[PDB]
Amino acid sequence: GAGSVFRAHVKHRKGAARLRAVDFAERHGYIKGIVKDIIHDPGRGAPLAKVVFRDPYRFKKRTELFIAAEGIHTGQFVYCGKKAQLNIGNVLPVGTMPEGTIVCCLEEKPGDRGKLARASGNYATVISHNPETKKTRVKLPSGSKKVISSANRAVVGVVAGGGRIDKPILKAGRAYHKYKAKRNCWPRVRGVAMNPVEHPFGGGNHQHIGKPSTIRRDAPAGRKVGLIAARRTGRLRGT
Amino acid sequence: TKGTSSFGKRRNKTHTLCRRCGSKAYHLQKSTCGKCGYPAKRKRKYNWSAKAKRRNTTGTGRMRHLKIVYRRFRHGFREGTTPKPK
RNA sequence: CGCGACCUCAGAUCAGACGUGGCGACCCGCUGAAUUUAAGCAUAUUAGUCAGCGGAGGAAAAGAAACUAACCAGGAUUCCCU
RNA sequence: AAAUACCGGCACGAGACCGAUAGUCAACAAGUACCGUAAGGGAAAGUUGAAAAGAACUUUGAAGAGAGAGUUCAAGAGGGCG
RNA sequence: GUUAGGACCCGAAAGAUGGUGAACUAUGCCUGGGCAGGGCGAAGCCAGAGGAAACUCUGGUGGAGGUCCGUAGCGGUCCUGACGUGCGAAUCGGUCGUCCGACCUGGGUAUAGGGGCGAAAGACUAAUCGAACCAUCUAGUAGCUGGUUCCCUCCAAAGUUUCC
RNA sequence: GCCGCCGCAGGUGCAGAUCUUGGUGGUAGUAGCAAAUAUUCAAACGAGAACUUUGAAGGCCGAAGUGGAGAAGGGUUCCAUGUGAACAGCAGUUGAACAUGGGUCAGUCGGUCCUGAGAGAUGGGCGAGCGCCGUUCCGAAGGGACGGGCGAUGGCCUCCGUU
RNA sequence: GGUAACGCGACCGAUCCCGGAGAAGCCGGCGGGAGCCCCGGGGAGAGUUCUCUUUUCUUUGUGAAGGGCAGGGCGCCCUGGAAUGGGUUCGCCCCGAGAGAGGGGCCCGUGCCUUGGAAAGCGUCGCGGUUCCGGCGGCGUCCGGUGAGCUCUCGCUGGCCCUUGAAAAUCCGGGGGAGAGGGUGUAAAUCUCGCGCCGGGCCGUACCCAUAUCCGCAGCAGGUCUCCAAGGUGAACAGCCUCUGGCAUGUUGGAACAAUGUAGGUAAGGGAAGUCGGCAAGCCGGAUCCGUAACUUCGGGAUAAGGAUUGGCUCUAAGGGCUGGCAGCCGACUUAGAACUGGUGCGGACCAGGGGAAUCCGACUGUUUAAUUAAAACAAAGCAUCGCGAAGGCCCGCGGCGGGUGUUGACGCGAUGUGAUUUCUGCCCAGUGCUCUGAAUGUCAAAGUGAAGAAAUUCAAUGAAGCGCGGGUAAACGGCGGGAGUAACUAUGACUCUCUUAAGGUAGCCAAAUGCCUCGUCAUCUAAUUAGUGACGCGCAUGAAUGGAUGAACGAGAUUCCCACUGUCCCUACCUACUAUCCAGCGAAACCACAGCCAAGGGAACGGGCUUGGCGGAAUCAGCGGGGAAAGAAGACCCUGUUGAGCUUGACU
RNA sequence: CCAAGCGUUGGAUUGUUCACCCACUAAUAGGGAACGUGAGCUGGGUUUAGACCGUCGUGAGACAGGUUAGUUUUACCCUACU
RNA sequence: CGACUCUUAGCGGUGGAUCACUCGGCUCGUGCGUCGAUGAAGAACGCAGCUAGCUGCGAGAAUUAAUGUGAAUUGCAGGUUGAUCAUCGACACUUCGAACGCACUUGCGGCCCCGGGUUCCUCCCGGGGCUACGCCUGUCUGAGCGUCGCU
Known part of the structure; x- marks a missing residue:
């Protein structure tokens, strides 16, 4: 997967997905779009x-x-900045917004344009x-909670297209x-289903592995x- | 099926005329010459094929500036003057 | 705010002069094998050789000692005999 | 600077060598005919006679092929012809 | 006479540099083209009747899906049929598998040899693949095969001994 | 054009190497010119008719064509005048062979002109080296315009292109 | 100009800003308009006439660009406010966010009229210059009617997606109002109105496009991308015949009709008795009307299985539109029933499933060894582990602020493990893997730090990670015992002890695609069965995501038996097509010490040639397949070689 | 004992060489002929390359342990025989 | 008797050894020691009265001048005031190529000056001259809260 025939298919895709910049508006007061x-x-x-936000130094319409x-x-209206109202799809920094509220497209560095929590059905x-x-402390999707820098922001709510793992894909x-x-990336061929020279696991009479699949x-x-650096292995009971 | 049926799927060309060596060996998709590497600033040539070099050196073609340096050489590169009249 | 000196740095189809590429038999600077010898083979051998890249000239390179000596001392460099 | 090196280039002079399956791949429209998509691979093939004097006219045939005339010291040298 | 040398001539399977190929096929991308006629009848809807309530029966309508029969196209089961100095360095014939979907094909494009690509057989990479092709190092090395050109004259062996 | 005697010198003597190159036999006038239905009668050109040319009969392809026109690729094979050697696996009057002589005309039908997956210069950076990496990333990356004003053209510097 | 949707011939003006267009998937249903096909009548020329036939065929026309009207579609505007709900499609679907009714407006208008345009074109009939005509004259180039027919287009509406179906050159429309134009004149700037005048360079343009001009060493049964597509029977671009246009049977003629072949048929009586095996062949087949089992994941199974009906001609009955519960006229198909009738013949050729009752394997569709394996292999949805919060995991690279996952961010990228659903998935951390703890602490190199010594050198303490010590782990790799004794007939063993390891095989499931002994043994199918299936478990070496047990559908997959049907057999016959054969013309190959009748004998132990016997009579045409230890390729098996390569780890470096 | 004149068969399970059962029969004796016989057939078994188990090994791999699918070339020359 | 089969000889076919010739190679030696932006080496297309190949040459195309030589060239026809032949010093050399306005489709441009549409008047068809990177010497136009200066 390191190049050539693999690289992601980008043509019918519709844009890269970000926040705004930051500027004097987001930084000393508020803007509406x-x-x-x-x-x-x-x-x-x-x-x-x-x-469509309206650009505040030339006549224009940013988007x-x-x-x-x-x-x-x-x-509907979206009002944002360091003051803007905490309701839904209204952006303002973690510094401001209270404890308990849910967020999406959250930032990690102050000003980086949002790197956390944008896949379907994810909070922070x-x-x-x-x-x-x-x-500030922020519990992310994996159980853990990052110490974060208090001026770094997130739109309010929960991400759209919720519940996609539900339905059984049926047909191949x-x-x-x-x-x-x-x-x-798909119809994925197992490692024991390769000759001696094509995968280390496959070879011989039966279709066994031989070596332990931890490494x-x-x-x-x-x-x-295989299972890389594997802290444990088996059917996970208890917790 | 590997043999003679698939020999009948031909209607296209990898190479054509180079425009330096002139040698039907200029690879379209990659765009340098197979014989000389046309885009490359100098030539291509090599010391592992010698019957390769001696199809193609200073004797071979016309020599059309050179064959009259050698002649101009041997008295003393005379320029300007003209032989005595009648 | 202006005016002037320097320093460090733009742009030109500004005025006049230089370089590229070729051939490569002999010369200079790099980089650099394995067949094969050892009755096997890893150090050794092949060999600083083959192939690769670079720069020249009518020759190149070297060159008037941080030199050889151990003598009753020879006195830049290259080349042949030993 | 010289005394050194020079299977490429420009002219030259020789040979106890080879003599057209030899000697260079090449004595000749050869690095040419032709093969490979391309890197590349790459032949075969010298000789009438002193002179063209290269056989008017006749005759069989539709035509090649023939019979007689004739040039030459010879066609028992007749245009891939000692 | 022994030896180093291309060393009496002819012969490997290998190994080593530097170079040419995706015009067949393997896969990812851009852009055009293509696919008879029939069968089965999922949701959604129209009345017609039954019951206190839920809701249920009877008749129509509708047009699903890696759904079936089956043509063009793509493929290649059995005859272990023909052909086997062939028409063909893998064809042809009757019978066969799929045929609105992970379908079937033209053009432009990316991937290069311990390297690429693989619904994975060590498959495919220009009639070559359990490591492609072209030139050189190279006349590579051989306790092993095959060959080894004129006459007469004279003498004429060995397969046993130690050490490898 | 060549040879004997005394002396020199060496790329010096063939039956063979599934040896190298060239030429010729037996087999042999033999294997063979068998896939997709099929022909026959008259004439006229001629030194030569089972095959070409005209006319009449009987047939096949059967619009998913043995029909009509294109793109790749071929490169003149297109079309008339002749020729009978060779070739077109019997024959040729025939031919896509041979020999001579003609033939491809556009604002409106294409390429050019714009981008697609993708190819790739300069600034930078890597590099012993020819060179490689990278394509918006360490860059002073725009050479243009309607007007305000100074002073210079052209045609009666009147009015405007031209600096 | 109009209430207004919007209309009229023009209808000034910059930098800036906003949007439109170029700009889109595939599949179903319905409607509009051309081409084409059909049907009744009119012209002109043909064909046929023994008899009939107002007959059978040929042919019958208008470019672009402009104006005018039909034909289609609207998510366009007005008055007006509707349950006794209404409007309406094949399906839908619409409405106090304004329906029915009425009246208007905009876009496409490839159809008909118009100028073009009859002056040309086509059909026929007749006259000139023999030539050398785009010669010249005449008639004609009509009128009606149908449609789920086929082909192209144009619109309206529905379905599908964890699949949402290109870019930009180019060109228009708007908001804004920077400005500009001249004082009622001759007027000015200004026009996206009509007329007019000058101009468009370069390269390609012939022909084949293939059972003859391209690739396959050739005029090669191979292979190579599209466009248009008439009549008849049919469900039909299927199969068979025919028009338009095409062709000379695909590098040969003539004569015979032998044995072998290669591709077609047919067979009295029996019917797999043939064979490894029903291999090959044959049987069934179209549509209408009845009728249909196990089993099931309820969707299927299912054309199950099993029957009957079907020709020809003479009738009857139903199913529509248009003009003004009735009258007139206009009309293209089907569907049901009855009768007469043929030597019991009708899907008359052509097209076109054999059926049933089980065992295993793999859920299904899909892919795969081009050129000896299409499968039980690969992939698959579903299940489960594993790493990872970017200074990041995984990965490429000889190198650089290098690149890929990524225009991404935990329902996310990467790495393995089994294989749809239902029911289930027991014990073992001693061993190796992997992991988490640290000064509880034995090994520890570079560099230093210090003292001894005249230095060259040596000793002493300090001492990273990794190794030792101690936790986590089997959907991490696998592994999951031995022996004597006991019940009132005998077998039998519920019970009892005893040695051992990390436990010691828990659910289930068997002489299997897996059991040596083995053709295991009771039962079932046959006259007879190393076979197939139903139980018994002792199981050499069955056992649970290294998966265990089961199951509807499915299969060019492996296996058994019954009804059908057959030249597969008893036992072979005859026919047809093409060769073979004989003749004219053309005319190659492999192979070849020398050659070519046998016995026995010896001999490198199986002679055509030697020795002893038998014997030996030109030259040849068709066959055959005993012999030449026949040809075809320096044995692919085995052994040697101090000859190699592909794979793998605790071999060595 | 002389006698090898004339015969010595049809079926089920199995790839068989061998084995065992049904039925008919004068009888269902045994053998050679390159363990007679592939340019006479068949390829069903073994004994290539694909695939699945059941033991062994950490493994590439291995099995007189079992399975599924796996292309049978030439005659026109001499002889022989017709 | 005859065909056919084998041997030998004569003469003919088929084939191209052997011999004899050589404007060609091989080896040694000597001497000189010269490519290029003023456009190389190498490619491509063109050039004869009759001409395809080798040769030689460039729209001045089997070559033009000049110096020398002094009556050809030739395969057929026609055409001494210097034929033909060697020398090379004056003149000239298509398109590509390091290859140079931008680009490889023989495609789109910008800057000036000339003859024609003219009566520069832009657009129009012809003809000419400049329009690559890197770098050194200096000249012109400029940038800097770099370092200072004087009002």
Whole structure:
């Protein structure tokens, strides 16, 4: 997967999905923009959303591509900055917004344009606060909770296109078309189903592995294959 | 099927005329010459094929500036003057 | 705010002069094998050789000692005999 | 600077060598006919006679092929012809 | 007479540099073209009747899906049939598998040899693949095969001994 | 054009190497010119008619064509005048052979002109080296315009292109 | 100009800004308009006439560009407010967010009229210059009617997606109002109105497009991308025949009609008795009307299985539109029933499933060894582990602020494990893997730090990770015992002890696609069965995501038996097509010490040639397949070689 | 004992060489002929390359342990025989 | 008797050894020691009265001048005031190629000056001259909260 025949299929896809910049508006007060269409993008079973903000130094109309928060609809108003009202699809920094509220398309560095929580059905909740240091705790999707920098922001709600793991894909084709609008990756051939020279696991009379399928973190390539650095193994009971 | 049926799927060309060596060996998709590497600033030539070099050096073609340096050489590169009249 | 000196740095179809590429038999600077010898083979051998890249000239390169000596001392460099 | 090196280039002079399956791949429209998509691979093939004097006229045939005339010291040298 | 040398001539399976190929096929991308006639009848809807309520029966309408029969197209089961100095360095014939979907094909494009591509057989990479092709190093090395050109005259062996 | 005697010198003597190159036999006038239905009668050109040319009969393809026109690729094979050697696996009057002589005309039908997957210069950076990486990323990357004003053209510097 | 949707011939003006167009998937249903096909009548020329036939065929026309009207579609505007709900499609679907009714407006208008345009074109009939005509004259180039027919187009409406179905050159329309034009004149700027005048360079343009001009060494049964597509029977671009246009049977003629072949048929009586095996062949087949089992994941199974009906001609009955519960006229199909009738003949050729009752394997569709394996292999949805919060995991690279996953962010990228659903998935951390703890602490290199010594050198303490010590783990790789004794007939063993390991095989499931002994043994199918299926478990070596047990559908997959039907057999016959054969013309190959009748004998132990016997009579045409240890390729098996390569780890470096 | 004159058959399970059962029969004796006989057939078994188990090995791999699918070339020359 | 089969000889076919010739190679030696932006080496297309190949040459195309030589060239026809032949010093050389306005489709441009549409008047058809990178010497126009200066 390191190049050529694999690289992601980008043509019918509809934009890269970000926040705004930051500027004097977001930084000393607030700005308002309107929503002009919710809109589907491929390689990403969740919807985007165009939003005409008006540029505040020339006559113009800027136009962005947020990650659409459920409950948004068209025509509606989006008011944002360091003051703006905490309701839904209204953006303002973690510094400001209270504990308990849910967020999406959250930032990690102050000003980086949103890197966390934009896949379908993902949050990044706010827990606690410490205003000498200017730091904040945020429970992310994997159980853990990042210390974060208190001036770094997130649109309010929960991400659109919710509940996609539900339905059984049935037919093998429905896979193909899922994985024909992403990258060369599918009908996946097992490692024991390769000769001596084509995968280390496969070879001989039966179709066994032979070697234990855990391996050192500190292997080289060609070998680091299987369960990597595996803390434990088996059917997971208890917790 | 590998043999003579698939020999009948031909209606296209990899190479054509180079425009330096002139040698039907200029690879379209890759766009340098197979004989000389046309885009490349100097030539291509090599010391592992010698019957390769001696199809193609300073004797071979016309020599049309050179064959009259050698002649101009041997008295003393005379320029300007003209032989005595009648 | 202006005016002037320097320093460091743009742009030109500004005025006049230079370089590229070729041939490569002999010369200079790099980089650089394995067949094969060892009655096997890893150090050794092939060999600083083959192939690769670079620069020249009518020759190149070297060159008037941080030199050889151990003598009653020879006195830049290259080349042949030893 | 010289005394050194020079199977490429420009002219030259020789040979106890080879003599057209030899000697260079090449004595001749050869790095040419032709093969390979391309890198590349790459032949075969010298000789009438002193002179063209290269056989008017006749005759069989539709035509090639023939019979007699004739040039030459010879066609028992008749245009891939000692 | 022994030896180093291309060393009496002819012969490997290998190994080593530097170079040419995706015009067949393997796969990812851009852009055009293509696919008889029949069968089965899922949701959604129209009345017609039964019951206290839920809701249920009878008749129509409708046009699904890696659904069936089956043509063009793509493929290649059995005859272990023909052909086997052939028409063909893998054809042809009757019978066969699929045929609105992970379908079937033209053009432009990316991937290069311990390297690519693989619904995975060590498959495919220009009639070559358990490591493609072209030139050189190279006349590569051989306790092993095959050959080894004129006459007469004279003498004429060995397969046993130690050490490898 | 060549040979004997005394002396020199060496790329010096063939039956063979599934040896190299050239030429010729037996087999042999033998294997063979068998896939997709089929021909026959008259004439006229001629030194030569089972096959060409005209006319009449009987047939096949059967619009998913043995029909009519294109793109790749071929490169003149297109079309008339002749020729009978060779070739077209019997024959030739025939031929896509041979020899001579003609033939491809556009604002409106294409390429050019724009981008697609993708190819790739400069700034930078890597590099012993020819060179490689990268394509918006360490860049002073725009050489143009309607007007405000100075002073210079052209045609009666009147009015405007031209700096 | 109009209430207004919007209309009229023009209808000034910059930088800037906003949007339109170029700009889109595939599949179903219905409607409009051309081409084409059909049907009744009129012209002109043909064909046929023994008899009939107002007959059978040929042919019958108008470019672009402009104006005018039909034909189609509207998510366009007005008055007006509707349950006793209404409007309406094949399906839908619409409405106090304004329906029915009435009246208007905009876009396409490839159809008919118009100028073009009859002056040309086509059909026929007749006259000139023999030539050398785009010669010249005449008639004609009509009128009606149908449609789920086929082909192209144009619109309206529905379905599908964890699949949402290109870019930009180019060109228009708007908001805004920077400005500009001249003082009622001759008027000015200004026009996206009509007329007019000058101009468009370069390269390609012939022909084949293939059972003859392209690739396959050739005029090669191979292979190579599209466009248009008439009548008849049919469900039909199927199969068979025919028009338009095409062709000379595909590098040969003539004569015979032998044995072998290659491709077609037919067979009295029996019917797999043939064979490894029903291999090959044959049987069934179209549509209408009845009728249909196990089993099931309720969807299927299912054309199950099993029957009957079907020709020809003479009738009857139903199913529509248009003009003004009735009258007139206009009309293209089907569908049901009855009768007469043939030597019991009708899907008359052509097209066109053999059926049933089980065992295993793989859920299904899909892919795969081009050129000896299409499968039980690969992939698959579903299940489960594993790493990872970007200074990041996984990965490429000789190198650089290098690149891929990524225009991404945990319902996310990467790495393995089994294989749809239902029911289930027991014990073992001693062993290796992998992992988490650290000064509880034995091994520890570079570099230093210090003292001894005249230095060259040596000793002493300090001492990373990794190894030792101690936790986590089997949907991580696998592994899951031995022996004596006991019941009132005997077998039998519920019970009892005793040695051992990390436990010691828990659910289930068997002489299997897996059991040596083995053709295991009771039962079932046959006259007879190393076969097939139903139980018994002792199981050499069955056992649970290294998967265990089961199951509807499915299969060019492996296996058994019954009804059908057959030249597969008893036992072979005869016919047809093409060769073979004989003749004229053309005319190659492999192979070849020398050659070519046998016995026995010896001999490198199986002679055509030697020795002893038998014997030996030109030259040849068709066959055959005993012998030449026949040809075809320096044995592919085995062994040697101090000859190699592809694979793998605790071999060595 | 002389006698090898004339015969010594049809079926089920199995790839069989061998084995065992049904039925008929004068009888269902045994053998050679390159273990007679593939340019006479068949390829059903073994004994290539695909695939699945059941033991062994950490493994590439291995099985007189079992399975499924796997292309049978030439005659026109001499002889022989017709 | 005859065909056919084998041997030998004569003469003919078929084939191209052997011999004899050589404007060609091989080896040694000597001497000189010269490519290029002023456009190389190498390619491509053109050039004869009759001409395809080798040769030689460039729209001045089997070559033009000049110096020398002094009556040809030739395969057929026609055409001494210097034929033909060697020398090379004056003149000239299509398109590509390091290859140079931008680009490889023989395609689109910008800058000036000339003859024609003219009566520069832009657009129009012809003809000419400049329009690549890198780098050194200096000249012109400029940038900098770099370092200072004086009002």
